Write an enzyme that holds these catalytic residues in place. Sequence first.
Site, mmCIF file in Angstrom:
data_model
loop_
_atom_site.group_PDB
_atom_site.id
_atom_site.type_symbol
_atom_site.label_atom_id
_atom_site.label_comp_id
_atom_site.label_asym_id
_atom_site.label_seq_id
_atom_site.Cartn_x
_atom_site.Cartn_y
_atom_site.Cartn_z
ATOM 1 C CB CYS B 161 -2.118 27.293 12.135
ATOM 2 S SG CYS B 161 -1.903 27.991 10.553
ATOM 3 C CG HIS B 293 1.048 20.805 13.040
ATOM 4 N ND1 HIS B 293 1.481 21.615 12.210
ATOM 5 C CD2 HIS B 293 -0.272 21.174 13.309
ATOM 6 C CE1 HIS B 293 0.689 22.745 11.952
ATOM 7 N NE2 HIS B 293 -0.399 22.294 12.745
ATOM 8 C CG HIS B 331 -4.239 22.663 8.012
ATOM 9 N ND1 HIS B 331 -3.062 23.317 7.856
ATOM 10 C CD2 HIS B 331 -4.513 22.934 9.387
ATOM 11 C CE1 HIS B 331 -2.784 24.244 8.958
ATOM 12 N NE2 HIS B 331 -3.612 23.878 9.877
#
Lengths: 42, 498, 96
Positions: B161, B293, B331
């Site tokens: 990610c 995050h 996301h």
Amino acid sequence: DHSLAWDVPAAEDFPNAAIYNIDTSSESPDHYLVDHTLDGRV
Amino acid sequence: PEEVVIAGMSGKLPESENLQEFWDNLIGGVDMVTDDDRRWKAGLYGLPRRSGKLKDLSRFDASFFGVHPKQAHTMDPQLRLLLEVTYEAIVDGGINPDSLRGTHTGVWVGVSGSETSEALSRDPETLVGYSMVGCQRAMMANRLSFFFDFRGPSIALDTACSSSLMALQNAYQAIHSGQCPAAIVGGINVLLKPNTSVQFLRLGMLSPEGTCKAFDTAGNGYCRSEGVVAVLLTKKSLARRVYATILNAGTNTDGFKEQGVTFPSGDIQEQLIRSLYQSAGVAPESFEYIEAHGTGTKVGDPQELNGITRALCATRQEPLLIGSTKSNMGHPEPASGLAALAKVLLSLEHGLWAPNLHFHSPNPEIPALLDGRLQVVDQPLPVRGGNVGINSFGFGGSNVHIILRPNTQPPPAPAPHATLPRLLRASGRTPEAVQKLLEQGLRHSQDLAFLSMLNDIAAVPATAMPFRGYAVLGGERGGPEVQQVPAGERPLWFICSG
Amino acid sequence: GVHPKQAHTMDPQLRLLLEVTYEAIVDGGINPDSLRGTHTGVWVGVSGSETSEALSRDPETLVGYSMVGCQRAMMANRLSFFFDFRGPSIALDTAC
């Protein structure tokens, strides 16, 4: 210049006639089938 | 070393055709996640209905990039959108792309999926060879290097990610050591294979509601999203427009974790943060905003914010603003870092901190939120001014963190030559593009830097961009003029009258 | 320390690479426990994920393990996790 439209993969382009594998192994999720036994043969 | 700055930026994001629309959605409170049926039927396989999806994927200006129609049809949409976005980003900094041709510029691309190549290789007999050239994972960066003629490194690194931020860190390392004068960093992610979403759901990362309720008590899991973002980095001596200055950017892996590979670690992230702004020479009290995050998981969120609180809240007096763009637009796995960077840069440009959505009750497991030390941006907040920090922790374990010094350049004092009428020249693929450029220039007739940047980029060969126009700004008898440019060189002749 | 069920769903590339890496470390005469906790990095050059395609082809039966064991990014992160390397973990993809 975005006059044209190009190809793009569709949902059905990816996998998912149907074939099923019956495994009676202890780990296999179909392990329970070993219980259904008739005449001593499952 | 040499100063490293973020010269230009651009890209496409969910429910946003460009960066301006992306900011309009960010500050307007519009939720970008959608319940549409574009990629696949809603609810298939039990997947969450909501997801952040781009407006369109089937658009590409092949002729400009010299890609023949047969090859274009087999190109990954990621690659086409990345080509367009990279070209847009390069000009954003006011740099004419031709100026970099033949240079030692390097390209790093954070890509984590190749569903298109898998789809195009379905039938062994039908499939055509040039499909791989446009779909191969490595081709994501090599195509950019080929078209733009960059002689620097061309890499495509996954790193789960944190791909985008990892690529940004690698580019910063390259430029900082003098290896390259400029670099292109990109993160691309599209949703085309529902089986991947099913995998994620079985892993338990996705939230059934499809909402990344970052920092909130109801955190379940993140919502998959799409995006294409590119950023141009150059040494300060080359940048025309500077969004910010990269003070430091480091990396480290969580190493062995008892809980599991996917289980995030807080101590490692805190150590990374401390080492970064220690080696950068920055004091913790300078930080004004940290883009956490903020995935939305029940374990990840308490871990990282607690780590931020130990790392930066130990001695500072006033609260440290916290935020997470993932609550606005879902996301995007590989492009997560660059999307957050884009939000931060846009907020700095407009002087306002974009609010955070879906935050109603602080998570009880985080002492800072209940206390006043850590404060979430739940509504627009003016930018007071200070250093900023962005971090991205890939679920695999890779952690990336960077520190930015926002550019604060007050407008120049008025000068007599400002009153003088100026000339603005534009070039575009179609008359609409040229007219748009001229209109935007006219609306900002008093921005000398804007006019100069627009003038610099318009110099493009007529063959590539066949429509040209101009407009005299500040002159009463000034009307935009547009017309097609005949191809072929034309001699220039002077005549000295009598 | 890989559970038997996760072993089946792991990409063969990673399964072989773990053994190869461990052999390489000792080949240098360095006990792996010495490097534990250091800042050693892990760069792996891979350009294939065929295993992921096969395992993630049936939505009704595919399991979450496959993603952890087959994801291309996991090629380096698995080694970092097992050997406890705190350095960078990347998976380059440039072909050839």
